[PDB]
């Protein structure tokens, strides 16, 4: 029984590895060596959004392209307009410990989660003004690490109990559950079609789950430590994973291979977040070294370095328009680089 299952699993893994090796007919470095590298990138601070009194743990842009919600340990969800420096809303929090924040594409709803294990959805478009608890999602057995808005009625949330859950806002029930991770799910990224999503966990591996089917279509490995964050390529066939090994591994969906890896001797600390440019040429990654690195997605070279913040750089994001990059650290100061 157990021996037969183990033998079958080993045979399947060996066959998968053989197929992966066979499909590796070349390397992206050889193909891209003929592309002229992009010159040095120098970005300077344009906005220094300040007012948070504690350590900022999350950030998320908005469809308006000038909107970002920041959550900190003081227990405040602050919605900032990127163009100006005027706060729009300063929602308070029941629990001061919040680790994940998400902005709905429509802009009428926001989601928050943390150690409380209960996700709170707030309706920005209040009928009579003021923002309160529009909905509460409960049922998880651990802290929520990430969440994203598939639409205005469905929300996908990844918890620290090694699971992900798709909830219906109107019904307030777990319409779907995804399981299979061995470690805490610390990352989650939505594809442009909002149908298949890649999620990482502490198992040093990532899995692609289809929302419609809810099955592990593909599983990728290679990282030597936990995957802190993941970002999905704009094209729709690749993504990038950042871990504590001071490495950023870019994989592919159709190829089913680890396309490339980014690492340097100087950098030794882990990566807190990852992001992609509008065209995906530039990869953004914040480090515990209090800095951000812009790598060339097609040259495996550190194109640029952004220096700021006096403490750990935790959250990173890129506006949909691609005109600015937002980064939030434990210094209690967000920043916008352009």
């Amino acid at each position: 029984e157990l021996d037969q299952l183990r033998q079958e699993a080993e045979q399947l893994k060996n066959q998968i590895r053989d197929a992966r090796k066979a499909c590796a007919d070349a390397t992206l470095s050889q193909i891209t060596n003929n592309i002229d590298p992009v010159g040095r990138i120098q970005m300077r601070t344009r906005r220094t959004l300040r007012g948070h009194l504690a350590k900022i743990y999350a950030m998320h842009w908005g469809t308006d392209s000038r909107l970002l919600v920041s959550a900190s340990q003081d227990g405040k969800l602050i919605i900032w307009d990127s163009y100006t420096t005027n706060k729009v809303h300063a929602i308070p929090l029941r629990s001061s410990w919040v680790m994940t924040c998400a902005y709905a594409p429509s802009g009428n709803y926001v989601a928050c989660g943390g150690l409380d294990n209960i996700c709170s959805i707030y309706n920005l478009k209040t009928r009579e003004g003021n923002v309160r608890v529009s909905r509460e999602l409960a049922g998880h057995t651990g802290y929520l690490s990430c969440c994203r808005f598939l639409d205005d009625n469905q929300i996908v949330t990844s918890s620290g109990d090694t699971t992900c859950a798709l909830w219906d806002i109107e019904t307030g029930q777990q319409t779907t559950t995804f399981t299979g991770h061995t470690g805490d799910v610390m990352s989650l990224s939505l594809a442009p079609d909002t149908r298949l999503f890649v999620s990482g966990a502490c198992d040093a591996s990532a899995k692609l789950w289809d929302v419609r089917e809810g099955m592990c279509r593909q599983t990728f490995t290679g990282h030597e430590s936990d995957i802190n964050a993941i970002c999905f390529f704009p094209n729709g066939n690749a993504f990038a994973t950042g871990s504590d090994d001071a490495t950023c591994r870019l994989f592919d969906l159709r190829a089913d291979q680890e396309l490339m890896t980014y690492s340097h001797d100087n950098i030794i600390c882990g990566i807190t977040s990852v992001s992609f440019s509008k065209s995906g040429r530039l990869l953004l990654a914040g480090y515990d070294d209090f800095n951000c690195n812009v790598w060339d997605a097609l040259k495996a070279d550190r194109a640029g370095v952004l220096a700021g913040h006096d403490n750990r750089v935790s959250c990173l994001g890129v506006t949909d328009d691609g005109m600015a990059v937002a980064t939030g650290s434990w210094d209690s100061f967000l920043k916008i680089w352009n």
């Binding site: 499909c23 990138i41 005109m323």
Partner: protein
């Protein structure tokens, strides 16, 4: 019976049909080059066209 579920998941994952690593790299390069002209971060847009100006 977690072993059966793991075996089924492994079979489903192996059921995919990989095309080519070189083809994927070429597609990624083509996609990057197609939108290379719409990357304000890569190409600094004119200061008059930059909303964050002061």
């Amino acid at each position: 019976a977690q072993a059966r579920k793991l075996v089924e998941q492994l079979k489903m994952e192996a059921n995919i049909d990989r095309i080519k690593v070189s083809k994927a790299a070429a597609d990624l390069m083509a996609y990057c080059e197609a939108h290379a002209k719409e990357d304000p971060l890569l190409t600094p847009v004119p200061a008059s066209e930059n909303p964050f100006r002061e």
